[PDB]
Amino acid sequence: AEIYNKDGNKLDLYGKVDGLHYFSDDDSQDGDQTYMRLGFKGETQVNDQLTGYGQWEYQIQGNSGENENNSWTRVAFAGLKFGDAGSFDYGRNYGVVYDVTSWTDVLPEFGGDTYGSDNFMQQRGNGFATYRNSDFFGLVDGLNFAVQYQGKNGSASGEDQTNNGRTELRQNGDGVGGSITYNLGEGFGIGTAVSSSKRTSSQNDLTYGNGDRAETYTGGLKYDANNIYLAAQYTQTYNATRVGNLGWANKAQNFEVVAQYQFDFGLRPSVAYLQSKGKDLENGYGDQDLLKYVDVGATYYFNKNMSTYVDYKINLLDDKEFTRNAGISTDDIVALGLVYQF
Amino acid sequence: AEIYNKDGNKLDLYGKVDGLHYFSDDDSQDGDQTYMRLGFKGETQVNDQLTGYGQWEYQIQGNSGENENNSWTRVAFAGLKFGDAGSFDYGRNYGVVYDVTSWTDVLPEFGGDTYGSDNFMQQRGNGFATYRNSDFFGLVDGLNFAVQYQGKNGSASGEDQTNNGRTELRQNGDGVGGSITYNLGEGFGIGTAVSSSKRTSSQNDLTYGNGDRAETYTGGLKYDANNIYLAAQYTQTYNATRVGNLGWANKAQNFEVVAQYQFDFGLRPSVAYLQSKGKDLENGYGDQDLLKYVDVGATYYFNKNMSTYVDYKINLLDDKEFTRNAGISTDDIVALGLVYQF
Amino acid sequence: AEIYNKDGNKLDLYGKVDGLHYFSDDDSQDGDQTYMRLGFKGETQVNDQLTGYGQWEYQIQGNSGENENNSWTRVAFAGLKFGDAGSFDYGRNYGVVYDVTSWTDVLPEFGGDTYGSDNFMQQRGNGFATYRNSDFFGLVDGLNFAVQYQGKNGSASGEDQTNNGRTELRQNGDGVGGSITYNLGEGFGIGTAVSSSKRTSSQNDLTYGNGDRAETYTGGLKYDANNIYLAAQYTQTYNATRVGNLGWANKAQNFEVVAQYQFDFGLRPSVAYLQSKGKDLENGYGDQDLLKYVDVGATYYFNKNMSTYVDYKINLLDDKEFTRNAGISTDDIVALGLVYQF
Ligand SMILES: [Ca+2]
């Protein structure tokens, strides 16, 4: 909600409380999943061709006892917008791959999980320097592009050390990526994104998915008109898709597709399919499905501040030694949520 | 404070800073106790018979150094209010037992401690689904009731596992409870509450207080008029009252009583007595006092945003092997507080 | 930003996002340093001669992954201001030494580091009771003083225990200090501060800097007019200046000096020099430099809500066994920051 707007400076303080429960045979997923987010988006007019901005978003789990706290920063960045010349921001932000893969990340609860956070340039991550340009310098309506750099986020100590070190599955070396999207008209959009990240020496000491670079190549399509939403994304990755908590897939092929309809009375059913196919895994595993499910659900929007939903992950992965070793869930989940937001 | 009210959506952002110091021979209590809370309460009008809401409240200790952070979520829930048909909410909230025991939880600093947080359905806890009805459907003025369910919050791994696992003393199985309060008129109120929670297998592997279910039965009475506040609550529990950090009392009898007066110039003296009597404790302990103190104090309210208080916990427990083993404090405490709130 | 002002109560909710990167051969400093702060400052008019207030400020690092959270309370206090009779506040706050040493803590990124946080009464710390008077009771314009007490913040357990125990380098015993500053006119200011804190037995079990009390003596001078800022502070300490993470200096002499100029178009160059000279260190180290650098940098202010800066720490310490043992950084750092604030 915009809570301040005075003398060229505006501040939106926003958030949500999601009273959320999962039902699953997977005891690591089953039970209370209540959480909240809080954030702000601020903007300051500097002059005719320059606006400054800042955004922060934080998640605090609501499903723990008072003896602990599970919270984290989703984004935290500052930037400048310069008219038709583009914008630049730096901080914790979304990787440019998500400029296209976000088109399928629209499910009531699940979805968006052929990749994760702190996962090279695929989604949220630290130290992104991001240049963006909408409508190609004001010359081509509907043609947008981005160019992005990510500095190394290494280990806590030793050869890969940076100030902000972390575990191998959340590290990266220096990376570069970009995206292009185009409005084809009549509700249709097409997009592509590429990223290439150096990997660190400690990442390459894990058994799975060695290589000098983590690479991703994405294409996407969407239709968004007449109360219909359709989208698909295909992403091919190299040493970039996590294999549970074991390392990465030498290669993976990720595909997500979704269809939704918004009824005027407030109901938005959703059907989707997601898969991630890993190739050439070490330890004799070879080709393995890393993710495979159908998702059926619906959100009922009471208004823009209140909603409720059901989401059903129909998990098509087989329970096998591989999935158990990797810690990949093979069970179905039903989610029920009630959401207040501002 | 209400900081937003527009187009049927309202947001109250509230908080407090309590500059607080304890004086005690108990070194685990003595010293700086400064803390803050922050929260919001949002409400959205959906239609003539339906309002959505969300509430979140967080505590951050202000008495640590910058190398650590001690914070936690008090509540986090979302709900719907259906005019006279009642309300429903889900998330981290107060157990319905507290609908009655809260009547004595009014001391300047101490009190409210014959039970704790994450303590079956007695106070704050995860995964409450709560139905409430005020003035009995608009048929009986002053008659309120609630019915509540709490899903299992289990262990981090193994047989009792849920996604949001925690230590035994803060676990629960599936539970159900209810409360009824009635305005007798002329300032008097009467209330009762009952709860019954399944206990988990890991809870039942501790030495103290094994059983299938944790159950509570509460009666309360109060007078709240003419600047006088008098209240008492009596609660009988089974396998539900913590014995320090060792487990639970097979049975306990808890009693709290308080008298206060509000002077028009701002001063509110308070006198109270609390005890918790544990029965049939294991390891030869038998009947033991778990809590026993007189409390004398006063709050001076400068206005609705600023107050200061003294509170004196006169601890009547004897220092003995049992209390030392259980980690129950037997020393007096004096608290001095200065509170800004909004 | 002031977001509420009604019926005698006002609330300023403020914060910043600093998109920040360090370049250094010191891998513990190098890399992404993005962070945010959030805070509030509230004030309530009680009557003609009394105002209540509260302030809280929190830092949340923006340079970690989502599997961790690094955050802390900077300040959290409540107070009363009694017209010209002065103010009193209690909580986590700044020690009165900083009333003078803050005059040099004005660099774009670095600076302010001949002392740290939770470092006796030198900067931020727990449990400060602080009396302040501006303009000497309304009788002497520009003459300010303060008197401050800090209660013991001891160990987690054992002989020095307090409720809010911490590691030795962040402990203190009971302390007293004061400051006096005077506006000489025409941009000139002069100040002095003195503090004396009991040390704890666990502090005195460390090798470096044992003694009954930690003591500090500070003088400062500044010139602040005609777009020029000049300041210097000299502090002599006894058992109060940290030697890396090893303990304290039996004696230290700290000197900071800074010169800045503000151009109308928004650029503020800055040049500074800082040194901390430790004396009589144990383990044969004798006299050692603890800190020594020249700082050159500049901030460009777009407006009151947006800025960017470069800061260059030219480290003059030698890499030698002492600095490596103490964990004192001897490398240069360049910082680049982009800051949105409200
Ligand atoms: Ca490979």
mmCIF file of C-alpha atoms in Angstrom, chain A residues 5-307:
data_model
loop_
_atom_site.group_PDB
_atom_site.id
_atom_site.type_symbol
_atom_site.label_atom_id
_atom_site.label_comp_id
_atom_site.label_asym_id
_atom_site.label_seq_id
_atom_site.Cartn_x
_atom_site.Cartn_y
_atom_site.Cartn_z
ATOM 1 C CA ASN A 5 3.675 10.425 -1.378
ATOM 2 C CA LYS A 6 5.058 13.902 -0.834
ATOM 3 C CA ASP A 7 7.443 16.315 -2.576
ATOM 4 C CA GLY A 8 8.485 13.781 -5.301
ATOM 5 C CA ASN A 9 9.105 10.840 -2.916
ATOM 6 C CA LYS A 10 6.789 7.847 -2.619
ATOM 7 C CA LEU A 11 6.869 4.732 -0.408
ATOM 8 C CA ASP A 12 4.782 1.575 -0.718
ATOM 9 C CA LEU A 13 4.829 -0.644 2.346
ATOM 10 C CA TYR A 14 3.417 -4.003 1.373
ATOM 11 C CA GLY A 15 3.009 -7.498 2.747
ATOM 12 C CA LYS A 16 1.008 -10.649 3.099
ATOM 13 C CA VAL A 17 0.016 -13.223 5.662
ATOM 14 C CA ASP A 18 -0.605 -16.661 4.168
ATOM 15 C CA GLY A 19 -2.386 -19.041 6.559
ATOM 16 C CA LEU A 20 -1.240 -22.163 4.807
ATOM 17 C CA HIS A 21 -1.455 -25.903 5.447
ATOM 18 C CA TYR A 22 0.060 -28.815 3.485
ATOM 19 C CA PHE A 23 -1.271 -32.380 3.449
ATOM 20 C CA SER A 24 1.315 -34.936 2.361
ATOM 21 C CA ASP A 25 2.731 -38.385 3.002
ATOM 22 C CA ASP A 26 6.131 -36.607 2.877
ATOM 23 C CA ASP A 27 6.599 -35.647 6.544
ATOM 24 C CA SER A 28 9.157 -32.986 5.496
ATOM 25 C CA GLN A 29 6.300 -31.150 3.675
ATOM 26 C CA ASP A 30 3.183 -32.098 5.708
ATOM 27 C CA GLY A 31 1.658 -29.696 8.208
ATOM 28 C CA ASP A 32 1.510 -26.009 8.991
ATOM 29 C CA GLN A 33 3.227 -23.801 6.382
ATOM 30 C CA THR A 34 1.998 -20.373 7.526
ATOM 31 C CA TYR A 35 4.269 -17.485 6.541
ATOM 32 C CA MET A 36 4.330 -13.746 6.029
ATOM 33 C CA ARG A 37 6.224 -11.309 3.836
ATOM 34 C CA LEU A 38 6.886 -7.606 4.362
ATOM 35 C CA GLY A 39 8.555 -5.225 1.934
ATOM 36 C CA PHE A 40 8.874 -1.700 0.665
ATOM 37 C CA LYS A 41 9.229 -0.099 -2.749
ATOM 38 C CA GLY A 42 10.400 3.521 -2.688
ATOM 39 C CA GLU A 43 10.925 5.971 -5.527
ATOM 40 C CA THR A 44 12.325 9.524 -5.586
ATOM 41 C CA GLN A 45 12.125 11.914 -8.508
ATOM 42 C CA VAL A 46 15.569 13.505 -8.956
ATOM 43 C CA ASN A 47 14.990 15.438 -12.185
ATOM 44 C CA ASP A 48 13.106 15.221 -15.543
ATOM 45 C CA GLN A 49 15.122 12.233 -16.784
ATOM 46 C CA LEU A 50 16.106 10.583 -13.489
ATOM 47 C CA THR A 51 14.291 8.675 -10.746
ATOM 48 C CA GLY A 52 15.960 6.837 -7.853
ATOM 49 C CA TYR A 53 14.445 3.738 -6.322
ATOM 50 C CA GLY A 54 14.921 1.089 -3.676
ATOM 51 C CA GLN A 55 13.134 -2.154 -2.906
ATOM 52 C CA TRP A 56 13.331 -4.662 -0.056
ATOM 53 C CA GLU A 57 11.285 -7.797 0.573
ATOM 54 C CA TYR A 58 11.594 -10.126 3.548
ATOM 55 C CA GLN A 59 9.969 -13.459 4.462
ATOM 56 C CA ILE A 60 9.329 -14.564 8.022
ATOM 57 C CA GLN A 61 8.020 -18.046 8.613
ATOM 58 C CA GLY A 62 4.869 -18.193 10.772
ATOM 59 C CA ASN A 63 4.992 -21.940 11.384
ATOM 60 C CA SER A 64 7.741 -22.145 14.027
ATOM 61 C CA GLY A 65 7.723 -21.854 17.790
ATOM 62 C CA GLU A 66 9.062 -18.823 19.644
ATOM 63 C CA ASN A 67 12.374 -20.502 20.392
ATOM 64 C CA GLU A 68 13.420 -20.057 16.798
ATOM 65 C CA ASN A 69 13.178 -17.717 13.835
ATOM 66 C CA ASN A 70 13.333 -18.645 10.167
ATOM 67 C CA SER A 71 13.504 -15.522 8.062
ATOM 68 C CA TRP A 72 15.386 -14.228 5.049
ATOM 69 C CA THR A 73 15.792 -11.398 2.570
ATOM 70 C CA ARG A 74 14.210 -12.085 -0.782
ATOM 71 C CA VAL A 75 15.370 -8.876 -2.497
ATOM 72 C CA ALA A 76 17.273 -5.734 -1.456
ATOM 73 C CA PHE A 77 18.413 -3.378 -4.192
ATOM 74 C CA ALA A 78 18.864 0.254 -5.117
ATOM 75 C CA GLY A 79 18.687 1.737 -8.599
ATOM 76 C CA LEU A 80 18.335 4.633 -11.020
ATOM 77 C CA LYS A 81 15.909 4.921 -13.939
ATOM 78 C CA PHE A 82 16.987 7.236 -16.785
ATOM 79 C CA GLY A 83 13.993 7.748 -19.129
ATOM 80 C CA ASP A 84 14.268 5.737 -22.360
ATOM 81 C CA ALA A 85 18.039 5.177 -21.778
ATOM 82 C CA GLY A 86 17.202 2.337 -19.331
ATOM 83 C CA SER A 87 17.494 1.479 -15.622
ATOM 84 C CA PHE A 88 20.374 0.193 -13.493
ATOM 85 C CA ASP A 89 20.144 -1.480 -10.110
ATOM 86 C CA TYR A 90 22.425 -3.384 -7.771
ATOM 87 C CA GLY A 91 21.863 -5.698 -4.797
ATOM 88 C CA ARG A 92 20.001 -8.902 -4.029
ATOM 89 C CA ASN A 93 17.614 -9.284 -6.947
ATOM 90 C CA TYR A 94 16.266 -11.702 -9.545
ATOM 91 C CA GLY A 95 18.521 -13.168 -12.185
ATOM 92 C CA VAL A 96 17.595 -12.224 -15.767
ATOM 93 C CA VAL A 97 16.745 -15.859 -16.563
ATOM 94 C CA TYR A 98 13.608 -15.262 -14.491
ATOM 95 C CA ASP A 99 12.548 -12.514 -16.922
ATOM 96 C CA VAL A 100 11.278 -15.451 -19.019
ATOM 97 C CA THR A 101 10.956 -18.393 -16.652
ATOM 98 C CA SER A 102 8.669 -16.259 -14.425
ATOM 99 C CA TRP A 103 5.987 -16.587 -17.103
ATOM 100 C CA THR A 104 5.133 -20.099 -15.782
ATOM 101 C CA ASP A 105 5.698 -19.250 -12.079
ATOM 102 C CA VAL A 106 2.011 -18.446 -11.534
ATOM 103 C CA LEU A 107 0.530 -21.466 -9.776
ATOM 104 C CA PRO A 108 -1.654 -21.093 -6.709
ATOM 105 C CA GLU A 109 1.065 -22.524 -4.384
ATOM 106 C CA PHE A 110 3.496 -24.852 -6.185
ATOM 107 C CA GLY A 111 5.407 -24.309 -9.433
ATOM 108 C CA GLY A 112 8.516 -22.323 -10.261
ATOM 109 C CA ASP A 113 10.672 -25.184 -9.023
ATOM 110 C CA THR A 114 12.788 -26.494 -11.916
ATOM 111 C CA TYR A 115 15.302 -24.022 -10.328
ATOM 112 C CA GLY A 116 15.639 -22.315 -6.946
ATOM 113 C CA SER A 117 17.074 -19.355 -5.081
ATOM 114 C CA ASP A 118 20.817 -18.652 -4.928
ATOM 115 C CA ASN A 119 21.039 -20.928 -7.965
ATOM 116 C CA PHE A 120 23.453 -19.083 -10.245
ATOM 117 C CA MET A 121 21.576 -16.469 -12.340
ATOM 118 C CA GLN A 122 18.271 -18.382 -12.381
ATOM 119 C CA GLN A 123 16.217 -16.658 -9.673
ATOM 120 C CA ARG A 124 16.953 -14.630 -6.527
ATOM 121 C CA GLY A 125 20.634 -14.126 -5.697
ATOM 122 C CA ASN A 126 23.242 -11.778 -4.285
ATOM 123 C CA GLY A 127 25.272 -9.108 -6.030
ATOM 124 C CA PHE A 128 23.396 -8.616 -9.274
ATOM 125 C CA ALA A 129 24.206 -5.520 -11.355
ATOM 126 C CA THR A 130 21.302 -5.258 -13.783
ATOM 127 C CA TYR A 131 20.785 -2.986 -16.806
ATOM 128 C CA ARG A 132 17.285 -2.929 -18.324
ATOM 129 C CA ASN A 133 15.740 -1.273 -21.309
ATOM 130 C CA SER A 134 12.011 -1.183 -22.183
ATOM 131 C CA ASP A 135 10.658 -0.608 -25.692
ATOM 132 C CA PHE A 136 14.208 -0.579 -27.085
ATOM 133 C CA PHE A 137 15.263 2.988 -26.334
ATOM 134 C CA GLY A 138 11.738 4.229 -27.214
ATOM 135 C CA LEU A 139 12.359 3.047 -30.813
ATOM 136 C CA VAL A 140 10.666 -0.393 -30.892
ATOM 137 C CA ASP A 141 7.483 -0.677 -28.812
ATOM 138 C CA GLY A 142 7.281 -3.980 -26.953
ATOM 139 C CA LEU A 143 10.974 -5.001 -27.370
ATOM 140 C CA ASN A 144 12.681 -5.166 -23.958
ATOM 141 C CA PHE A 145 16.136 -6.434 -23.053
ATOM 142 C CA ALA A 146 18.384 -6.774 -20.042
ATOM 143 C CA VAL A 147 22.064 -7.335 -19.429
ATOM 144 C CA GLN A 148 23.228 -8.571 -16.032
ATOM 145 C CA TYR A 149 26.430 -9.264 -14.123
ATOM 146 C CA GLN A 150 26.788 -11.241 -10.863
ATOM 147 C CA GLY A 151 29.964 -11.069 -8.765
ATOM 148 C CA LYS A 152 31.391 -14.162 -7.102
ATOM 149 C CA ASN A 153 29.644 -15.257 -3.880
ATOM 150 C CA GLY A 154 32.077 -17.820 -2.542
ATOM 151 C CA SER A 155 32.959 -19.847 0.534
ATOM 152 C CA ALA A 156 33.221 -18.823 4.176
ATOM 153 C CA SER A 157 36.964 -19.621 4.224
ATOM 154 C CA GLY A 158 39.717 -21.021 2.087
ATOM 155 C CA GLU A 159 40.411 -20.731 -1.605
ATOM 156 C CA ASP A 160 36.926 -19.517 -2.676
ATOM 157 C CA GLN A 161 36.444 -17.041 0.151
ATOM 158 C CA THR A 162 34.349 -13.904 -0.157
ATOM 159 C CA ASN A 163 33.066 -11.730 2.681
ATOM 160 C CA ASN A 164 29.584 -13.230 2.353
ATOM 161 C CA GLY A 165 30.525 -16.873 2.052
ATOM 162 C CA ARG A 166 28.040 -19.727 1.930
ATOM 163 C CA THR A 167 27.604 -23.423 1.276
ATOM 164 C CA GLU A 168 28.509 -24.819 -2.138
ATOM 165 C CA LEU A 169 24.927 -25.274 -3.401
ATOM 166 C CA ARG A 170 24.395 -21.505 -3.015
ATOM 167 C CA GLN A 171 27.764 -20.254 -4.325
ATOM 168 C CA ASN A 172 28.617 -18.754 -7.678
ATOM 169 C CA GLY A 173 31.565 -17.295 -9.524
ATOM 170 C CA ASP A 174 31.490 -14.211 -11.727
ATOM 171 C CA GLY A 175 28.531 -14.433 -14.129
ATOM 172 C CA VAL A 176 26.959 -12.710 -17.092
ATOM 173 C CA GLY A 177 23.523 -13.042 -18.633
ATOM 174 C CA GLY A 178 20.845 -11.346 -20.631
ATOM 175 C CA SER A 179 17.229 -11.480 -21.732
ATOM 176 C CA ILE A 180 15.071 -10.284 -24.607
ATOM 177 C CA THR A 181 11.273 -10.182 -24.678
ATOM 178 C CA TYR A 182 8.906 -9.084 -27.428
ATOM 179 C CA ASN A 183 5.212 -8.271 -27.442
ATOM 180 C CA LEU A 184 3.852 -9.961 -30.593
ATOM 181 C CA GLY A 185 0.458 -8.322 -30.022
ATOM 182 C CA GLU A 186 -3.047 -9.672 -29.436
ATOM 183 C CA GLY A 187 -1.943 -10.987 -25.982
ATOM 184 C CA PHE A 188 1.115 -12.962 -27.214
ATOM 185 C CA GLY A 189 4.648 -12.620 -25.850
ATOM 186 C CA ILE A 190 7.897 -14.393 -26.766
ATOM 187 C CA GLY A 191 11.161 -14.339 -24.832
ATOM 188 C CA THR A 192 14.630 -15.748 -24.437
ATOM 189 C CA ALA A 193 17.328 -15.581 -21.776
ATOM 190 C CA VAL A 194 20.906 -16.828 -21.429
ATOM 191 C CA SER A 195 23.291 -17.009 -18.488
ATOM 192 C CA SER A 196 26.857 -18.133 -17.938
ATOM 193 C CA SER A 197 28.397 -18.297 -14.469
ATOM 194 C CA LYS A 198 31.827 -19.329 -13.364
ATOM 195 C CA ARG A 199 31.664 -22.168 -10.841
ATOM 196 C CA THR A 200 33.882 -22.244 -7.765
ATOM 197 C CA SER A 201 36.546 -24.796 -6.830
ATOM 198 C CA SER A 202 34.527 -26.007 -3.806
ATOM 199 C CA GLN A 203 31.484 -26.540 -6.053
ATOM 200 C CA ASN A 204 33.668 -28.690 -8.298
ATOM 201 C CA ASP A 205 34.773 -30.824 -5.321
ATOM 202 C CA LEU A 206 31.206 -32.169 -5.046
ATOM 203 C CA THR A 207 30.600 -35.418 -6.935
ATOM 204 C CA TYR A 208 27.755 -34.224 -9.168
ATOM 205 C CA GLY A 209 27.885 -31.758 -12.004
ATOM 206 C CA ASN A 210 31.491 -30.592 -12.325
ATOM 207 C CA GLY A 211 32.529 -27.955 -14.838
ATOM 208 C CA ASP A 212 34.131 -24.569 -15.195
ATOM 209 C CA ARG A 213 30.786 -22.849 -15.890
ATOM 210 C CA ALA A 214 27.106 -23.155 -15.092
ATOM 211 C CA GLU A 215 25.086 -22.226 -18.234
ATOM 212 C CA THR A 216 21.375 -21.758 -18.971
ATOM 213 C CA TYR A 217 19.438 -21.228 -22.209
ATOM 214 C CA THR A 218 15.717 -20.395 -22.086
ATOM 215 C CA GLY A 219 12.861 -19.825 -24.478
ATOM 216 C CA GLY A 220 9.347 -18.851 -23.496
ATOM 217 C CA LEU A 221 5.914 -18.054 -24.856
ATOM 218 C CA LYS A 222 2.810 -16.639 -23.273
ATOM 219 C CA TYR A 223 -0.753 -15.662 -24.068
ATOM 220 C CA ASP A 224 -2.385 -13.164 -21.698
ATOM 221 C CA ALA A 225 -5.764 -11.811 -22.872
ATOM 222 C CA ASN A 226 -9.534 -12.430 -22.720
ATOM 223 C CA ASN A 227 -9.275 -13.792 -19.158
ATOM 224 C CA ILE A 228 -7.021 -16.598 -20.375
ATOM 225 C CA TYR A 229 -3.427 -17.119 -19.314
ATOM 226 C CA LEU A 230 -1.233 -19.650 -21.107
ATOM 227 C CA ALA A 231 2.512 -19.987 -20.837
ATOM 228 C CA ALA A 232 5.405 -22.334 -21.469
ATOM 229 C CA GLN A 233 9.136 -22.199 -20.831
ATOM 230 C CA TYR A 234 11.915 -24.518 -21.928
ATOM 231 C CA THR A 235 15.356 -24.236 -20.316
ATOM 232 C CA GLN A 236 18.482 -26.270 -21.057
ATOM 233 C CA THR A 237 21.123 -26.141 -18.361
ATOM 234 C CA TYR A 238 24.720 -27.218 -17.831
ATOM 235 C CA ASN A 239 26.135 -27.799 -14.310
ATOM 236 C CA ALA A 240 23.360 -25.486 -13.044
ATOM 237 C CA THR A 241 20.281 -27.512 -12.021
ATOM 238 C CA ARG A 242 20.551 -28.836 -8.484
ATOM 239 C CA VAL A 243 20.221 -32.595 -7.932
ATOM 240 C CA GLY A 244 18.546 -32.516 -4.562
ATOM 241 C CA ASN A 245 21.269 -31.554 -2.124
ATOM 242 C CA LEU A 246 24.029 -33.600 -3.851
ATOM 243 C CA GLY A 247 25.346 -31.146 -6.456
ATOM 244 C CA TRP A 248 24.142 -30.429 -9.994
ATOM 245 C CA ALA A 249 23.086 -32.195 -13.172
ATOM 246 C CA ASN A 250 25.747 -32.161 -15.864
ATOM 247 C CA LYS A 251 22.907 -31.309 -18.218
ATOM 248 C CA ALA A 252 19.205 -30.812 -17.615
ATOM 249 C CA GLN A 253 16.188 -30.110 -19.749
ATOM 250 C CA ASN A 254 13.426 -28.234 -17.953
ATOM 251 C CA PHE A 255 9.930 -27.677 -19.218
ATOM 252 C CA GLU A 256 6.961 -25.923 -17.569
ATOM 253 C CA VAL A 257 3.528 -25.250 -19.037
ATOM 254 C CA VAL A 258 0.418 -23.675 -17.496
ATOM 255 C CA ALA A 259 -3.150 -22.758 -18.410
ATOM 256 C CA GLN A 260 -5.443 -20.555 -16.305
ATOM 257 C CA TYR A 261 -8.830 -18.880 -16.666
ATOM 258 C CA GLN A 262 -10.234 -16.013 -14.620
ATOM 259 C CA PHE A 263 -14.033 -16.307 -14.147
ATOM 260 C CA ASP A 264 -15.706 -12.956 -13.484
ATOM 261 C CA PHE A 265 -17.117 -14.287 -10.154
ATOM 262 C CA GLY A 266 -13.587 -14.558 -8.749
ATOM 263 C CA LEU A 267 -12.415 -18.136 -9.362
ATOM 264 C CA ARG A 268 -9.169 -18.783 -11.234
ATOM 265 C CA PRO A 269 -8.588 -22.454 -11.971
ATOM 266 C CA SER A 270 -5.097 -23.530 -12.976
ATOM 267 C CA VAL A 271 -3.614 -26.637 -14.609
ATOM 268 C CA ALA A 272 0.113 -27.129 -15.147
ATOM 269 C CA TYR A 273 2.835 -29.639 -15.939
ATOM 270 C CA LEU A 274 6.479 -29.436 -14.894
ATOM 271 C CA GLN A 275 9.449 -31.649 -15.575
ATOM 272 C CA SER A 276 13.214 -31.556 -15.161
ATOM 273 C CA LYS A 277 15.219 -34.246 -16.908
ATOM 274 C CA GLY A 278 18.804 -34.664 -15.703
ATOM 275 C CA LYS A 279 21.471 -36.166 -17.979
ATOM 276 C CA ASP A 280 24.850 -37.825 -17.426
ATOM 277 C CA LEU A 281 24.685 -37.934 -13.618
ATOM 278 C CA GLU A 282 27.728 -39.386 -11.846
ATOM 279 C CA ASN A 283 27.814 -42.530 -9.676
ATOM 280 C CA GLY A 284 26.136 -44.574 -12.394
ATOM 281 C CA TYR A 285 22.865 -42.639 -12.209
ATOM 282 C CA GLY A 286 22.993 -41.425 -15.821
ATOM 283 C CA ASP A 287 19.667 -40.008 -16.957
ATOM 284 C CA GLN A 288 17.174 -39.318 -14.139
ATOM 285 C CA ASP A 289 13.960 -37.393 -13.716
ATOM 286 C CA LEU A 290 14.633 -34.633 -11.145
ATOM 287 C CA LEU A 291 11.098 -33.208 -11.102
ATOM 288 C CA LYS A 292 7.835 -34.410 -12.676
ATOM 289 C CA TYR A 293 4.333 -33.366 -11.689
ATOM 290 C CA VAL A 294 0.934 -32.270 -12.777
ATOM 291 C CA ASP A 295 -0.551 -29.392 -10.802
ATOM 292 C CA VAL A 296 -4.285 -28.756 -10.499
ATOM 293 C CA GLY A 297 -5.648 -25.970 -8.317
ATOM 294 C CA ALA A 298 -7.719 -22.829 -8.048
ATOM 295 C CA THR A 299 -7.612 -19.427 -6.380
ATOM 296 C CA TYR A 300 -10.759 -17.558 -5.360
ATOM 297 C CA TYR A 301 -10.086 -13.837 -5.211
ATOM 298 C CA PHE A 302 -12.442 -12.126 -2.754
ATOM 299 C CA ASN A 303 -10.836 -8.842 -3.857
ATOM 300 C CA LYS A 304 -7.248 -7.504 -4.412
ATOM 301 C CA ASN A 305 -6.492 -7.848 -0.655
ATOM 302 C CA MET A 306 -7.954 -11.284 0.168
ATOM 303 C CA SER A 307 -7.869 -14.685 -1.481
#
